[PDB]
Every structure is written in C-alpha cells, then in structure tokens.
Amino acid sequence: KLNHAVFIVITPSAIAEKYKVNLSVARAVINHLADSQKLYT
Amino acid sequence: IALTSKNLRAIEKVCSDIMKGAKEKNLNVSGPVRLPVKTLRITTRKSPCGEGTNTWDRFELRIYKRLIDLYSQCEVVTQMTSINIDPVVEVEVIITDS
Amino acid sequence: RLLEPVPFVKTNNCIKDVDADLFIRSYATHLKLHNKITYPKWCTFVKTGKGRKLAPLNEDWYFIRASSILRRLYLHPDIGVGFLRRQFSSKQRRGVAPNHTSLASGKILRSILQQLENLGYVEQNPKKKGRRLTTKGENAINNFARYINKKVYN
Amino acid sequence: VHPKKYGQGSRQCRVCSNKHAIIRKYNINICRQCFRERADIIGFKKYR
Amino acid sequence: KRVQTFGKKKTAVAVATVTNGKGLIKLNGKNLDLVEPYILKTKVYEPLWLIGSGKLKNLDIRIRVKGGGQTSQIYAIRQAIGKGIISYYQKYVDESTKKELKDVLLRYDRSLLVGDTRRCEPKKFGGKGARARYQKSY
Amino acid sequence: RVRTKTIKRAARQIVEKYYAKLTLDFQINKKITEEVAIIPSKRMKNKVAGFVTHLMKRIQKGPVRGI
Amino acid sequence: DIKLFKKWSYEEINIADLSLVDCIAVSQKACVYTPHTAGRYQKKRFRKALCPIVERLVNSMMMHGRNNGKKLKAIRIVAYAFEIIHLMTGENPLQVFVNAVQKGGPREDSTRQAVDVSPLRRVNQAIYLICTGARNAAFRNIKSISECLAEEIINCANESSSSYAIKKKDEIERVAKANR
Amino acid sequence: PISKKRKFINDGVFQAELNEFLARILAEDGYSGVEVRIRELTSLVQKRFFLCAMAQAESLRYKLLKGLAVRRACYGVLRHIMESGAKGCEVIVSGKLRAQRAKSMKFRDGYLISTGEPSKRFVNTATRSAQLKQGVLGIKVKIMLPTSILPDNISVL
Amino acid sequence: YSYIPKQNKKLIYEYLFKEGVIVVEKDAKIPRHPHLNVPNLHIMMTLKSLKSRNYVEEKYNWKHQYFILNNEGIEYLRE
RNA sequence: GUGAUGCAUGGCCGUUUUUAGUUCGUGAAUGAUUUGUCUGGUUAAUUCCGAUAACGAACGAGAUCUUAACCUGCUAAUUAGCGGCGAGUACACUGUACUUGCUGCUUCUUAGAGGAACAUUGUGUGUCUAACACAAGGAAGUUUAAGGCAACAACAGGUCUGUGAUGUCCUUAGAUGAACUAGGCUGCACGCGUGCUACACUGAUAUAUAUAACGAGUAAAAUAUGCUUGCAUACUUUUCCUCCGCCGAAAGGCGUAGGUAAUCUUUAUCAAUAUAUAUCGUGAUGGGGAUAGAUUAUUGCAAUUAUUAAUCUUGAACGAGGAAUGCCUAGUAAGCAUGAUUCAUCAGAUUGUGCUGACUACGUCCCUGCCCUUUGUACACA
C-alpha cells in the first residue's frame, strides 16, 4: 500500500531509497536539484 | 519472344534451338532472361473419411518462363519456331528495332 | 550523450544526415513558436486509431504527428493516406479474441496533409502521384537541417 | 425455385456433383476426395 | 577507381561500392550512425579499428542496405564492407598491407569475411510448434 | 554411420581392373573412380570412391583379403 | 577497449573457486554492451557454459506468466539493476553479482543419499534460485522488480538471511542433514 | 484473356477430362496416341469445345469379367509380362473371391522396388475394378520398365 | 404443365440428325445450350427416352453424356 | 435414393509402424517346423565385420531430389541491378540526399546447369577389419541439416453420407427424386479436450525510426425507351486485388491510375515482440476484460438467435495456481504476430511464413511402450 509523497548520488532508485518516496516524485526532486532511463553523468 | 511451360528440359531445348537459329541468322538479338522460379503449392487432407490421424500432404508446380528478343521477320520467326516447338510450350512474340 | 565520435567524413547536405528523432522535436518546437498551423480544435475529442483506445494525453500530438509527416515526406517522397495509415498502424485488442494489427484513422492524416498543402510545404501532381516536397520547401528544410546540425554540434 | 449466384449453392464439384469440401484455389472447382487422386494427371505431384 | 562487392548473411543482403574519394561512407540516404542501435554501430565499427581510419580517409564507399532484420542488415553490411575493402586492396591501392589485412581480419574472427547459412527450417506437421504438436487427450 | 554392402562390393570389384592407373593422390584416386565408374549419383560416386581410398590405405602394410 | 553498456570492462575478476570462472566463461569473446546476443549453445555441451553469466541471467529472468520471452526488457531490467547497484554499493555491479552467484549455489544435494553438485549446475541452480527469489519479490512486495533483483543480488553477495536463494540452500542442506 | 496460372489449371483439368474419356472409350485395343473411329471423337471434342502396364491391367480386366478362372488368368498375365520383357511383375486381385470373406493374394517376380523417388520414376502401376455378381474385384498391377541406368546397378568392364 | 411442343421435338430431331454426335449436359437448369437456341429442359427427357428405345448409345461420364448415334435410328426418327 | 448393411465389398486412409523386419532357390536337420535370418563387436538399421550346415538371392533399411549455403568474374538480363553523362535543386573545395532520359556492363535483384563435402588431412580409440574422437581448411564434418516415398502380414479399424465404385435388401405420388416457406446442430446442472484473453512494472500508456518471406489477386451492374417505382427490349462493362484524391471519429462511402500479375496493392518495403524518450512506478491499481443497452455501416432478398462492425456507458475471476495430466533438443521451445484453406459475410479451426533467437544432454532404462535371445505355460478370438 502506497504512502510515499514528495514532502521530506542523484539517481532515481538511490534517492527513492534514501527519502522513502515514489519514483516519480524522486525524479521530480532530482530535476529540481540538478537544475527512458539514461546513462548517468 | 517469351516462352512458358512447367518442365525445364523442354524450355532448355527450345531456347537452345532459338539461339542456335539466332546465331545462324546473325541478327540483332537481346540477351537471355532468366526469371526466378514461380511455384504453385496447395496442401490437402488425406483419409477420405473422418477417421484416423489427421494427415495432410503438400504439392508443388514450378512454372518456368523466359524472354528473348530478335530483329527479324515475324512470319519467318513464327515459322522457324512452330517447326521445332512442342505444343506443350506457349510462346509469344514482340519485335525490336534498335 | 546522444552524440558519438564520427569516424568518417560526413556531408550534412540535407536532413537525413541529422537525427530524425530530435529533428522532429525541433520542428515541432519551431511550429509551436511560429504558429504556422492551427491545432485544429476540431480533432481534440478523437483517438488517433481504433486500437489506440486512449487519448494521446500530451496536448501537442498534432505537432508531433505533423513533424513525423514531414520526416516521412522527405524520407520517401511518394506517400499516400493508405501508406501513412499502414505506417501508423498499431495493435488492437478485441477482448477475448486475439489482438490484431489495425490502421489509424484517416481523417486526422487527411487534415494534416491538407494543412501542409495550405502551408505550401507539400504539393500534388499527377506524375509522382504521392505527396511531394516543393523546391522552396526543399531549400528551407535543407537550411533548417543545417541550422539544427550546427546548433547540436557547436 | 430460389437460385442465386452467391453462397455455396452457386457451385459444386464437377465430378461428384456435391457441395461439400470444394476448393476454389486457382479455380479448380473440385472436391478434395477426387482431387487427391486426380493430382498426378493434373500435374499436382507431392514433393515435400 | 571503383569496384562493387556484396555481403549476404541471414535474411539481409547488403551491397557496397568502394571508389576513390575522401572518406564519404553512406547508408542509403543516411549514414552508418543513424541506424539506431549504438550496440551494433560498434560492431560495424570494428573493421575501422582493425584496419585504420587514415586509409579510409582516401576511399569513398557507398552502401545500399535493404531487407531483413536489423541484426541481419548490420551483419550483411559488415560482410560487404570487408569484401569491398579486401577487393580494393587487391586491385588498386596496395597488396603488401592486404597480406596483413587478411591476417588481422581472420585473427579477429571468421564472421566478418563470410556470413552464415543459418536460416529457418520448414515448419513441420502435427501442431503449432515446429517440433511440437497438439496436446494429446486419452 | 557404417557402409552399405552395395558400395562395398562396388569397391571390391573396382581396383582389380586398373590398379596401374590408381595412385597415391586422393583426388586422382577419386577421378579414376569417376572415369571407370558408372554410378549415376554424384554423391554415391563420392562415397564409393572414399571407401576405395580407405581400402587403398590398408594395402602395403598387410593383406587386404582380395584384389 | 570493450565496455559493458559502455560502462564496465570488468578488467578485474575475482578468482572465485577456479571453476565458476570457466562456468561463466566471460572474456573478450563473450564481451558485449547489451544482453540478448546471438551466441549458440545447442551444437555442443561446452558452448552452453560458454554463454556469459549475465546472458544467462537475462534469459532466465523472463519466466513469469505473460512476461515470458521479453528479453529486450530483460536487457532493460538488468541495465537498470546495474545502474542502481553501482551506487547503492560502490562495488562494480558485475563483480558483486559474481560473488553473489559464487556463494548462492548449493554444493551437495541429497536427492536419492547425497550427490556433490557439478560446477555447471551449481551455477545454473544458483541462477534459478535467484530468479525464483526475484519472482516471489515481484510478488506483492510493493517495490519494483529492479530493486527486488538488486536486493537479492547484494543479499546473496553479502550472505544475509533475507535471501530466498540462501534460504532454499539451507533447506536443501537441512534435508541433507536429516538424511545423513 | 485469362491468367497463365488459371490457364495451366485448365490444361490440367482438361488433361484429366480427356484421360478419363480415353480410359472409358478405349477398352478394346492398345493406345495409338492422342490427337491434338477418329471422326466420332474428333467431332465430339470439337463440338464440346467450340508392354504397357495400363494395357496389361486392362487385359486382365478383359480376361476377368467373363468368368475365367482367376489363377490361370493372372498366371497368363505374368507370362505375358515376362514375354514382353519386364524385369518383374506384381498382380493383386482382392475382393470376395467366390466366398463371403474378403481375400487378396500376391504374385511377385523380379525386384519389385517399392519406395523412393527413382522407384516412382521407374515403376509403372495401374489399378482397375471388375463388377461381379456379389461384389467388386479390385486389381492392381505393377510392372517395372527395364533400365536410364538404375542408381543401384554397378558393373565395370 | 411444361408441355413439350411437337415442333420443339422436331427442331432438335433435325439438329441431332445434321451432326450425329451431341452432349446434352446432365444439368437441366441451364436455360440454353452452346449449340442450341432452345430450352434443353425440353430435350434431355426426349433424348433419354430415345436412349431407352435402344437407338442411340451413351458412354456416360461426370457432368457429360457423350451420346453416340447408331445405324438404326436415322430411318426411325426421320419421320 | 445422404435409405439399411464397412460384419457382403472395391478404392483410399489410420494404426501395429519411421521400427527393422519379411521372403525365396538349392542344400542340410515321421511331422508341425528349423537353419540360412547367428555367439560376439558396431550402428540410422539383419548396418556391416566376423564365426558359421549353410551357399546364393529379393524386398524393407539404404538411396534421390527441393530448401539456406560457396563458386563456376560460367549464361545472361525482363518486370532487376551496376554505372556513365544531360540539367540540376543546397552543401564542400584544387562528391554528397532528391529529381530527367538513353545506353560501356551483368557478381550484385535471379536462376538453367554443373561443381563443391568423400571421416578430407594428420594426432588417437578399435580384434587394426567393420566402428568411433580431437584439431584444422571450409558455408557445408551428428548423412550439413528439415521435408517424401514405408516391405510382409494383420485389424473382421473408418468410410457404401465422395463418386453413375459397388452386391444384396428396402422405397417411390401421402416419394426415401427435386424444389419452396419457416425451424437445428449457436440452447445448458454439468464433464472432457482441442483452443482464445488475464493476474502486470521483466509492465498498463503515447510518440517513431530498422524492419522480412511463403504469399494472393479481374452469365453480372447501371442507362434509356415503351407500357404503367414495376415488366420487356438496346447499349459499355460493374461482378479480384486495389493505389490515389475526396466525404465520414470510425465503420464505411464516392470517382478514377494500375495489374490475368518480379510491372499495380507492394515490395527502395506491409505485422508484432521492439526501439528511445516521456504519464504511471505493483495501490484487485489506472492492470485485467467475463459483463449490458444504445447504435451506426458494410456482406447477403432475408442478420430476429443482438452474423460482421467503429463509438460511449458495463468492471467477474485472476496475487502464479487441487486430485490428475499433455507437449517439447536448435535459427529450433516459448512469446509474438501474419499469409493461405474453407469464404457473399464470419477464425477463437487447420496449414504455411517470419521476428525476438532461451534455463538445461553428447546420455539412461526407473515408469510407460516397443525390439532380440533364453525360459515356463494347462493361453491360441492368444
């Protein structure tokens, strides 16, 4: 049962496991911090 | 001048005669045409009744046809063909000029 | 990322030399910027294909499709509504019965090609029955491809 | 009568005069039972 | 000057024609880069490292690729370009380097020079599977 | 795989006529079988000639039980 | 030169038990960017082991109902697993996965008495147990199969109890102890 | 103006038509060929359109329908095959055979090759029916023409 | 009804006379014959009756009859 | 006569049965019979070697040919390819993508023919005979593989409802001949198969590039006249695949290019598993589609029993699976589609074609089923 959200090593799964968040909001936060699957920088 | 049949030996012998006559008459002749084979295949069920293992069998008919061109009189070419062609082969004629 | 070290001597004289996937996005961006075409509002409630069964849910699918259409016109200059439907064909699920391929709706493609004809990027003629790119459109797309190449290179 | 140029009633086997198991494949208009024995003379030779 | 060669392997057939030029290599209207698979792009690229780009800088090879699966097209274009370069070496540019050219190509593998005859077999009787048939009920 | 009695008696019956023409070279020994042999199948000619070569390489190191 | 997914050349490989190295048979001949190669394995017996270990993983991951045969997305899933593994733990994903395979295989099985396990089928059974663990983790475990398989790999490599392959090995050895 | 493939199918079906016509009408003598007595069938076809194994089988049918003894009839058939010069022969006549139980017999001479593409190309076979008082007698007669050269034959001079 | 006209008998009587060989087709539903501008559905029964009169012979086949005229029918059917 | 009788028959077929078995001449050993046709080794197999009262034969096995495959710079180009130049459309600098037309040429698009692969060559295993391995060239070393022909004998196996193939018996005006109206095998407590679509994130979803081959394709419309929409008559060709341009969300409709076909569909290229980026990120969920009404168009004189069909509403099981039980060893399992058959319309059926090209053999007789030898029988419809 899903309970994660966006309210509180930049890759999706790493950030998701760190912050206990959904993958979508994790990618959103990743783009927020930086600014289908692609090779890492 | 295109020929058509189903067996290869007849077309081979008649084409041999055709280019031998072409060499004899030393006329303007186009190169031979060697078409990819066209096959007719059907598959039917054996066992006329409805009993036993369902067994089918397949068939094949390989149709052979080639083309050539010659610059000669239509009457003389049709005569020299009809003299030495087997009625089992069907041949049509197209003339060329240059 | 998408760039790779080219080991041979290129030409870059036309649009096939540039990547199609990003060139269509660049043309869609230019299309939205210059507002060359309409949306049109008439098609905002129709699925692209019978087997699609879902809305495109992007709001720019007409621009995407038009960019694709122009890519098609260049890549093979003798097209038709049937050829376009065949290329845009997708799967269609008949419930219990097995899934079958099916073509896209033809009205959307007809509207897109009429819009392109009005824009003059594509024309018609008895000889070369399919839709063809004009000479002005040819030179314009050549310079657009060179511009995109320079933009993504230097 | 109620004849028509449509459906299975417009044609039948040319030997057995039956409407069952008739192949229109290349317009042979024949039944499988008789065709499986007429194949050799017709030119239908089982090969592979 | 100009020579035409072919590569036939799997379903796809590729044809090449190597001429004098400056290193213009074309795949139909596209190039070797816009195929899509970056995985097979380097597979095609392997002869470039095996032989040398500086010598390709003096030869233009046009290529027509048509028919079959994408992997088969990649393999066929590899075969065609290998045969074309070996023929151009044997004919026009130089033979002494061609002696080491064959030695290096065959050292890498036998697949580049000659394709494989692997193709599908006629599916047999019995059922949907080629070697499998319908489920038996007693 | 083993061999067939027919090809075996073929190999036995040949050689005895023109062993003089028969030499060491394997391909030449093939060609002499093509020349002297009247088998229509090319593959069957190939197989019988291979058996003759195998029979040959048994000679001049012991008896061959015939010829 | 060659780099898997253009990332790893695995120029360093752990010695393992000197038999798993030949079992996986990964080398310059077996090197590739993406899985799902065109290597043959049904003309001999050694070629079957010659298929690379990652290739065997991708072509064994595919078995669950409708998902069967989708080895393009097996490529995708293993690529994503490598990506996430490389920074969830600093070790090379291929190397840590290699140690996982090394210690995830049963060595003695008591089917009918007990029999020592050949290296080939020790590797095959380790892979099979890992695949079953990943499938039962795609079963009702909230998280994606990417994280499921990655956690299974790292758990097998570090020898923790939460691993289904290790639990099944323990069950097999318990049967061995009961018989003997 | 018809397709060549449909034309070939028509040629085959007409070949079957004329073959069964010849089988029906030609029951008193051998085969003198085909035309591309004579007046009747030539006019019929124009109006409608606008040592042999077959001979041996029909000869056995001729010897059979009149009530001649089966054993001597077939024996004379094989004598005819041997005097013609065939390598061998095979005559089967199956049916009631004067009893209420179905029965068949076999009379084989020579090799009688029975399987293979060259076997088909070399063996000639014929089948026929005889209408009798309380049943149908089925006759199958096979003759192999003497040997181009047979694949199996090997002889070096 | 389907009463057979006397003249309907007569024209086919002359028609088979002037040739000697005819095929009347077993099917009767076809309105016209390739060599007859006459309803065959008035002719097959007449030919079958003349057959049972032992004057013409028919070898018979599938979808074709192939009747053959004998020597002793022309004098009878002439008048 | 699709009325009975396949237990009266013919022919065909399905099984014993894709295995390895069957028979003869002469010889030899009250008779049925035995030997040949085997102790042993080997195997694709009574296949060979060999021992041998057997010697010598015939069938079956073996063999042949198509498919991909290499070459024969053989043989050449139609409807194919290669170019060269005739004018270029934009770019480089001392040819390039797209168009126009003729022809230096035929490996390439291809087939006529033939060749090439025979344990080939050596390092080995073998009674040094039959048999088998390694390594190499080679596209071709398990017959290179996949396709078909299947002996002798038998079943009282299926079919007289395929035949004007067929005997006997039965029937015909209230037909058991034919036609016509309507009706059924599509209904269902259930069962068993053949099979179709799910349980997802290895996936639900939107974009597009890289996509193949077997394939398959031509007694009727409408117009006018007369009588009074219908009847008769004269005119072209509508009666296959169809491209295109329009109309319609679609279904589908309208008018034409082309093709009786490597020429037009389409083929410098038709499907799906893709693809890369993006919504979602395992929450009976958005998965999933059992499930309804409302309809719109086509096929057919006729669709009610919603034939077929696009549209919106409808929202079951299903968390990888009971007792049981089926199939399967390499471009093949499985997944995915798709051509063809029946077809006026209808694949969820059969048969072919291809893509993605997997977890695991060089074996064993434990079950099941066969084959051989010995043996015991009171069985022989075994």
Side-chain angles (χ1 to χ4, degrees), chain C residues 88-105:
Chain C
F88 274 89
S89 170
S90 178
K91 287 159 113 129
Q92 87 100 348
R93 176 150 56 196
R94 317 150 61 212
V96 152
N99 173 1
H100 292 47
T101 201
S102 68
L103 303 104
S105 315

Side-chain angles (χ1 to χ4, degrees), chain H residues 2-148:
Chain H
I2 326 290
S3 147
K4 297 195 294 291
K5 176 208 48 55
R6 274 153 71 179
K7 153 253 287 183
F8 262 15
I9 284 308
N10 264 357
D11 306 313
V13 71
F14 185 48
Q15 183 54 300
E17 297 276 336
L18 68 104
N19 181 29
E20 56 84 10
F21 212 165
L22 293 174
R24 287 275 172 147
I25 61 179
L26 306 190
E28 321 288 337
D29 201 2
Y31 285 161
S32 185
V34 300
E35 164 77 19
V36 181
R37 294 189 70 198
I38 287 321
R39 173 191 177 184
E40 279 100 8
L41 89 183
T42 300
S43 69
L44 258 160
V45 302
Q46 267 213 351
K47 270 279 161 283
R48 170 223 74 71
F49 162 63
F50 286 89
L51 68 156
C52 303
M54 183 49 242
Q56 299 322 298
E58 77 146 315
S59 190
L60 187 270
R61 193 213 193 289
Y62 211 144
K63 220 164 296 160
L64 217 286
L65 61 175
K66 72 248 300 178
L68 204 271
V70 187
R71 278 72 32 197
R72 43 195 42 72
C74 55
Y75 288 161
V77 169
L78 308 87
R79 311 319 149 80
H80 193 359
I81 318 304
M82 311 335 297
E83 75 155 340
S84 62
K87 187 255 310 156
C89 154
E90 163 74 334
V91 47
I92 300 332
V93 46
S94 76
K96 296 271 294 184
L97 269 310
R98 157 229 43 77
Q100 280 72 8
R101 257 301 186 169
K103 165 258 194 185
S104 324
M105 18 46 66
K106 296 92 184 178
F107 297 135
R108 320 183 154 92
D109 297 64
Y111 311 153
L112 250 295
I113 184 59
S114 68
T115 164
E117 174 244 327
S119 88
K120 168 40 54 172
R121 101 152 272 163
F122 254 57
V123 168
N124 190 302
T125 325
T127 313
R128 207 34 58 84
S129 165
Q131 229 276 1
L132 261 287
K133 163 266 170 173
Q134 215 215 18
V136 165
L137 270 298
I139 291 91
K140 337 196 174 92
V141 182
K142 330 177 173 196
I143 297 85
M144 307 56 64
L145 59 98
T147 205
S148 289

Side-chain angles (χ1 to χ4, degrees), chain F residues 1-6 8-9 12 26-27 30-31 41-44 46-51 53-55 57-58 61-63 65:
Chain F
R1 43 211 71 171
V2 325
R3 293 51 180 270
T4 294
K5 66 190 147 296
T6 69
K8 274 147 177 296
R9 34 190 60 91
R12 265 79 186 258
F26 182 126
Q27 303 334 120
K30 301 274 304 286
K31 304 320 167 274
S41 156
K42 52 177 286 299
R43 175 202 198 203
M44 263 308 97
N46 217 215
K47 181 69 230 63
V48 300
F51 193 54
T53 42
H54 181 12
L55 262 42
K57 56 186 56 85
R58 299 284 71 72
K61 52 152 179 309
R65 284 141 301 300

Side-chain angles (χ1 to χ4, degrees), chain E residues 2 4-6 8 10-11 13-15 17 22 24 26 28-30 34-38 60 62 64 66-71 73 83 87 91 106 110 114-138:
Chain E
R2 195 159 200 150
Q4 165 189 351
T5 50
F6 57 105
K8 314 162 310 188
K10 313 201 83 155
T11 316
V13 201
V15 193
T17 291
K22 227 92 158 196
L24 266 69
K26 297 293 291 293
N28 295 354
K30 259 173 272 182
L34 319 94
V35 281
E36 165 259 322
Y38 37 78
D60 280 356
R62 81 160 191 110
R64 32 182 175 150
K66 173 188 183 178
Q70 61 291 343
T71 89
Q73 298 264 71
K83 163 182 292 203
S87 170
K91 289 187 173 181
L106 194 54
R110 201 167 149 216
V114 182
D116 201 309
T117 174
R118 270 171 288 181
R119 276 294 97 195
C120 173
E121 53 82 55
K123 189 259 276 193
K124 310 162 85 144
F125 199 19
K128 293 205 162 193
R131 225 160 299 167
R133 78 269 172 150
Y134 298 134
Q135 153 177 286
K136 185 98 147 300
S137 61
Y138 294 100

Side-chain angles (χ1 to χ4, degrees), chain E residues 5-137:
Chain E
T5 50
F6 57 105
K8 314 162 310 188
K9 147 168 35 190
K10 313 201 83 155
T11 316
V13 201
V15 193
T17 291
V18 47
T19 77
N20 297 330
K22 227 92 158 196
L24 266 69
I25 288 95
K26 297 293 291 293
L27 168 145
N28 295 354
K30 259 173 272 182
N31 313 307
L32 56 148
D33 286 77
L34 319 94
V35 281
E36 165 259 322
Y38 37 78
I39 41 186
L40 309 159
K41 247 196 279 199
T42 81
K43 298 283 295 296
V44 185
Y45 135 87
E46 306 273 2
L48 200 278
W49 206 5
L50 258 62
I51 316 177
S53 52
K55 65 151 277 206
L56 197 52
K57 207 186 172 180
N58 296 89
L59 317 180
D60 280 356
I61 309 177
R62 81 160 191 110
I63 307 106
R64 32 182 175 150
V65 201
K66 173 188 183 178
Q70 61 291 343
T71 89
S72 55
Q73 298 264 71
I74 288 296
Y75 305 154
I77 198 180
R78 289 171 332 115
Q79 181 187 358
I81 64 194
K83 163 182 292 203
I85 198 65
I86 212 67
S87 170
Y88 217 64
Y89 252 57
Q90 182 60 42
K91 289 187 173 181
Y92 289 99
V93 60
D94 53 346
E95 332 281 318
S96 81
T97 314
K98 190 214 186 197
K99 319 278 113 177
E100 187 259 8
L101 189 55
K102 318 156 201 82
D103 192 87
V104 156
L105 278 177
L106 194 54
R107 204 277 195 209
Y108 169 53
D109 64 349
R110 201 167 149 216
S111 303
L112 248 171
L113 302 170
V114 182
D116 201 309
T117 174
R118 270 171 288 181
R119 276 294 97 195
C120 173
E121 53 82 55
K123 189 259 276 193
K124 310 162 85 144
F125 199 19
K128 293 205 162 193
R131 225 160 299 167
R133 78 269 172 150
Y134 298 134
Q135 153 177 286
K136 185 98 147 300
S137 61

Side-chain angles (χ1 to χ4, degrees), chain I residues 21-78:
Chain I
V21 276
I22 39 70
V23 194
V24 291
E25 196 37 85
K26 190 43 75 167
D27 183 22
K29 317 298 116 164
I30 176 72
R32 72 205 181 281
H33 184 262
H35 290 39
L36 276 163
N37 48 13
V38 77
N40 312 131
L41 65 145
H42 287 290
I43 90 159
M44 40 293 300
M45 326 76 75
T46 60
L47 188 50
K48 194 251 304 181
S49 291
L50 191 277
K51 176 42 161 78
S52 36
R53 294 289 84 244
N54 322 336
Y55 295 149
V56 67
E57 302 320 303
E58 176 202 5
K59 215 88 198 313
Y60 188 76
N61 202 38
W62 30 290
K63 300 257 165 74
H64 280 285
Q65 311 311 120
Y66 311 119
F67 277 80
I68 178 78
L69 265 58
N70 300 74
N71 300 19
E72 316 90 299
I74 301 166
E75 36 86 21
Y76 175 83
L77 192 102
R78 183 181 178 259

